[PDB]
Enzyme design. Structure first.
Site, PDB file in Angstrom:
ATOM      1  N   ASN A  24     -32.802  46.070  17.433  1.00  0.00           N
ATOM      2  CA  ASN A  24     -32.506  45.199  18.564  1.00  0.00           C
ATOM      3  C   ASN A  24     -30.855  45.488  19.075  1.00  0.00           C
ATOM      4  OD1 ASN A  24     -32.131  41.936  17.329  1.00  0.00           O
ATOM      5  ND2 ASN A  24     -32.473  43.755  15.840  1.00  0.00           N
ATOM      6  N   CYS A  33     -29.199  41.671  24.342  1.00  0.00           N
ATOM      7  CA  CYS A  33     -30.366  42.143  23.648  1.00  0.00           C
ATOM      8  C   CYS A  33     -30.796  42.607  24.895  1.00  0.00           C
ATOM      9  CB  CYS A  33     -31.488  41.027  23.277  1.00  0.00           C
ATOM     10  SG  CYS A  33     -32.447  39.986  24.067  1.00  0.00           S
ATOM     11  N   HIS A  86     -35.718  36.536  23.138  1.00  0.00           N
ATOM     12  CA  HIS A  86     -35.209  37.846  22.845  1.00  0.00           C
ATOM     13  C   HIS A  86     -36.822  39.016  22.645  1.00  0.00           C
ATOM     14  CE1 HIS A  86     -31.521  39.357  20.232  1.00  0.00           C
ATOM     15  NE2 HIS A  86     -32.598  40.250  19.010  1.00  0.00           N
TER      16      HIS A  86
END
Ligand SMILES: [Cl-]
EC number: 3.4.-.-
Length: 134
Positions: free
Chosen positions: A104, A38, A92
């Protein structure tokens, strides 16, 4: 066509085409092969648009949450980094796109666009947002 819009364009170019790999994207080989997690995905998208968010080898969600300026959740704007509590606090990150969506790289879908109102992401979002380009 640089900065925010450039990063969105580069990062989005590989949507649906780039499986996630935890720890990936911190070597030049992984970058060239579009292998990211990420935070290394976000670093690469912005670097490809002229914006330095940190070192290739050492950028993580923890380093990214220390970049830029805090933004209140109500004020999130396209290009802001949105953080979520997945496996750890701020584990994240994505790039907010406006309209309740974010770009993402995640396990389930690789590089992809997700919704802030997806129950999973809604529950994981705690209001941590960072603006990295003014
Ligand atoms: Cl790079």
């Amino acid at each position: 066509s640089g900065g925010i819009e450039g990063a969105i364009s580069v990062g989005s170019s590989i949507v649906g085409q780039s499986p996630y790999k935890f720890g990936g994207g911190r070597t030049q080989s992984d970058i060239n092969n579009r292998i990211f997690d990420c935070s290394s995905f976000v670093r690469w998208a912005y670097a490809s648009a002229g914006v330095n968010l940190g070192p290739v080898g050492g950028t993580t969600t923890d380093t990214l949450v220390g970049r830029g300026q805090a933004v209140s959740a109500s004020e999130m704007k396209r290009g802001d980094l949105v953080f979520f509590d997945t496996y750890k606090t701020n584990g994240h990150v994505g790039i907010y796109l406006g309209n309740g969506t974010f770009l993402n790289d995640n396990t389930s879908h690789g590089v992809s666009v997700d919704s802030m109102s997806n129950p999973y992401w809604k529950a994981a979002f705690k209001g941590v947002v960072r603006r990295v380009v003014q």
